[PDB]
Amino acid sequence: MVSKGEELFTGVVPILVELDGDVNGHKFSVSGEGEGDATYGKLTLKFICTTGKLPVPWPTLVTTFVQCFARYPDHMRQHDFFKSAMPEGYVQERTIFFKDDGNYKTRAEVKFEGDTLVNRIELKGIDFKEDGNILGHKLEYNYNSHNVYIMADKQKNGIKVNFKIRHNIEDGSVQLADHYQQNTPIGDGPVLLPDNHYLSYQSALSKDPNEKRDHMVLLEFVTAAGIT
Numbered sequence: 001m002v003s004k005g006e007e008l009f010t011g012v013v014p015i016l017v018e019l020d021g022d023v024n025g026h027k028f029s030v031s032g033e034g035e036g037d038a039t040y041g042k043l044t045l046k047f048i049c050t051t052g053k054l055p056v057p058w059p060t061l062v063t064t065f066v067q068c069f070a071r072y073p074d075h076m077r078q079h080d081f082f083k084s085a086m087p088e089g090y091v092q093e094r095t096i097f098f099k100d101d102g103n104y105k106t107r108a109e110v111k112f113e114g115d116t117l118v119n120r121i122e123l124k125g126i127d128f129k130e131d132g133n134i135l136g137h138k139l140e141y142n143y144n145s146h147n148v149y150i151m152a153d154k155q156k157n158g159i160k161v162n163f164k165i166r167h168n169i170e171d172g173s174v175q176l177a178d179h180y181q182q183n184t185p186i187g188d189g190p191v192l193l194p195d196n197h198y199l200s201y202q203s204a205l206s207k208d209p210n211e212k213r214d215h216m217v218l219l220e221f222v223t224a225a226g227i228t
């Protein structure tokens with residue numbers, strides 16, 4: 001049978017993202033909108049900085065900016081925590097360590113509000129260098145493909161996730177961002193606790209030629225794998 005969580009994702013779902021951020025005291029807000037099509041693992045989103053100029057590079061926020069839209073193969077359906085927690089939702093927490101620089105800590109609440117999948121995020125960044133690659137804006141506007149590794153965390157009725165992102169720096173080098181993540185259901189109901197597996201991401205960043213506000217257009221495809 002198809003679960004109630006699965007059923008919510010069988011079509012195209014509107015997405016709303018709202019973030020409040022503070023990185024080394026630079027305060028900013030971002031709003032995002034678009035659509036997710038989980039059957040195809042497809043995300044299409046546009047983000048706008050509503051407070052003026054974004055004080056960090058847009059690529060550093062890509063991972064923060066709805067893993068319930070991942071395409072899970074039929075044979076791996078019993079391993080899809082994210083959809084199983086819906087519609088009541090889940091809280092995602094991350095620490096993201098930028099090598100030789102500062103760190104972000106994020107808390108995101110992801111749930112349905114009517115037909116819209118909403119993610120409300122608070123991001124706090126500290127210990128950044130004033131002329132490091134982040135606050136000095138030295139990162140290229142592009143994105144590499146990566147795998148995201150998932151395991152159950154029974155004691156929390158959720159999952160633990162870890163992965164490394166390599167951001168290309170303008171001089172040809174790379175800025176590593178080590179991600180540690182936990183997700184916990186908001187409701188008290190049963191969720192699917194997965195066997196170890198991963199999600200494969202591909203991402204493309206672009207600009208809306210008619211948009212004068214600071215913004216990012218993101219197209220992402222996400223597929224679960226590792227169990228066959």
Ligand SMILES: [Cl-]
Pocket residue numbers: 056057058059141
């Ligand atoms: Cl940027």
